[PDB]
């Protein structure tokens, strides 16, 4: 039922790839060179929403292996007759050529990586690429559906295995996402090379997400900002009032008529009827989520820096460390800029970090990142930033 070229690729894969292991080809020109054993590279990503595609470097795996010899045998697969849509020009037949997984056992034993490693390999290492080898292609027998001519032997979809090189060569049929082709030495000494996650925006998402809610908080006239801040001054010094306020703001009518400063906050989100203004409730519910992540000592300090107008230094201090330690599942050593210190064991910003789970010493500006401190630190920044947004 193919119709156009990619639409034909879509259906071929939809029909033949039960496990979803195949990589579709996007353009007919790109299908050039994608044969069994072509080396393909995927360059580092610059977006979390799309990754650069596999591209042949027009090199075969035998070109990097010692004992130069012809490629091993390929194994022919089943042929499938699609008969197409939008020996018959209307008809198409696609067949499978694949490398037997057991071929690598003998091949990587009969032959070995040129230890004066291929000039091109040294290029890819500097460029940060992961390198793969094509293990299967689905190709046509004869030219097809030509107002659109597809030359015979055009690849529609392909599978790859990842190369890994540590003074040797191995082929991983099922690597994990993080697997690196170019393994570092025993010393861990490398140079400027795309590495450490194919790029990450851990910090970038947080600042904006806060800012959006901060922008959603722009809906408040500064007068309603003040009384809300009056209400916020209170619950931060009352653990139980904070919990009741959060519960008053869950899913299912007229808001809960909370006594005390939690009431003032609710009155900022309702009409004279007591019914919530969702676009006003929405941003506040977010902040309470951040605050609920924090500790009592953090709540008590957030109040005092608010009243003292000292929310700004801590916001900058937290921001840099979140900037430094991303990705936050990794462990790393951060560096305190003294140009933001405002310091001491009893300093308000010092205590905010201890409550997150970080241990601080007076004799060094280094701080180790603890991945378990991610949520509270992020909520801390969110609280600081949003509380700064209300100004």
């Amino acid at each position: 039922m193919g119709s156009a070229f990619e639409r034909v690729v879509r259906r071929v894969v939809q029909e033949l790839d039960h496990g979803g292991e195949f990589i579709p080809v996007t353009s007919l020109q790109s299908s050039t060179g994608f044969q069994p054993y072509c080396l393909v590279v995927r360059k580092p990503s610059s977006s979390w929403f799309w990754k650069p595609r596999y591209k042949c470097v027009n090199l075969s795996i035998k070109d990097i292996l010692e004992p130069d010899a012809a490629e091993p045998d390929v194994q022919r697969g089943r042929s499938f007759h699609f008969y197409d849509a939008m020996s018959s020009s209307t008809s198409m037949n696609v067949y499978s050529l694949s490398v037997d997984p057991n071929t690598w056992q003998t091949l990587l034993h009969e032959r070995h990586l040129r230890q004066p490693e291929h000039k091109v390999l040294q290029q890819l290492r500097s460029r940060g690429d992961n390198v793969y080898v094509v293990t299967e292609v689905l190709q046509t027998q004869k030219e097809v559906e030509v107002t659109v001519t597809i030359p015979s032997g055009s690849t529609l979809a392909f599978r790859v295995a990842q190369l890994v090189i540590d003074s040797d060569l191995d082929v991983l049929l099922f690597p994990d996402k993080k697997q690196r082709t170019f393994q570092p030495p025993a010393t861990g000494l490398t140079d400027g090379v795309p590495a450490e996650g194919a790029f990450t925006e851990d910090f970038q998402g947080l600042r904006a997400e806060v800012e959006t809610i901060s922008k959603e908080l722009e809906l408040l006239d500064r007068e309603l900002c003040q009384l809300l801040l009056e209400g916020l001054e209170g619950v931060l010094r009352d653990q139980l009032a904070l919990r009741a306020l959060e519960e008053a703001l869950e899913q299912g009518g007229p808001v809960e008529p909370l006594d005390g400063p939690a009431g003032a906050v609710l009155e900022c989100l309702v009409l004279s009827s007591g019914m919530l203004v969702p676009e006003l409730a929405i941003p506040v519910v977010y902040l309470l989520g951040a605050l609920t992540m924090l500790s009592e000592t953090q709540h008590k300090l957030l109040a005092e820096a608010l009243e003292s107008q000292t929310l700004l230094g801590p916001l900058e201090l937290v921001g840099s460390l979140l900037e430094q330690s991303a990705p936050w599942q990794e462990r790393s050593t951060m560096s305190l800029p003294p140009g933001l210190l405002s310091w001491g064991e009893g300093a308000p910003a010092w205590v905010l970090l201890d409550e997150c789970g970080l241990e601080l010493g007076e004799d060094t500006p280094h701080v180790c990142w603890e991945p378990q401190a991610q949520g509270r630190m992020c909520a801390l920044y969110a609280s600081l930033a949003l509380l700064s947004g209300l100004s």
Partner: nanobody, 116 residues
Framework: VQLVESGGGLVQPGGSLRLSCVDS????????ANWYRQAPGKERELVAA???????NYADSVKGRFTISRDNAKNTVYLQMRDLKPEDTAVYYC????????????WGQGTQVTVS
């Protein structure tokens, strides 16, 4: 990293045995599975085949005597073996075959089957 084969052993004629082919991944359920056997110094032969939808095929030397089945929840494909006779001593291996006809894993160590 591959498939794991167990169930082989030593039994007297007329016994019963059912091998296991276990996959650490979900490919055993979406793809087909085949059982082979090799006697030392001779060619590997297919004995039984099972597609993902459950279609069974067998070797005439074992037709009506072997059963290839799958347990989806166990991620295991079985080879129930019957009317046990000599000439069935061989190294038995299982594999996985994609709908396109390609193989998923390299060979495992196999399971030992001995008859006398």
């Amino acid at each position: 990293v591959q498939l794991v084969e167990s169930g082989g052993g030593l039994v007297q004629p007329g016994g019963s045995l059912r091998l296991s082919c276990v996959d650490s991944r979900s490919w055993i359920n979406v793809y087909g599975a085949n059982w082979y056997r090799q006697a030392p110094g001779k060619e590997r032969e297919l004995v039984a085949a099972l597609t993902s939808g459950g279609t069974t095929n067998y070797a005439d030397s074992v037709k009506g005597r072997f059963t290839i089945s799958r347990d989806n929840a166990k991620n295991t494909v079985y080879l129930q073996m019957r009317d046990l006779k000599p000439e069935d001593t061989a190294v038995y291996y299982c594999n996985l075959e994609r709908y396109t006809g390609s193989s998923v894993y390299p060979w495992g160590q196999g399971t030992q089957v001995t008859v006398s």
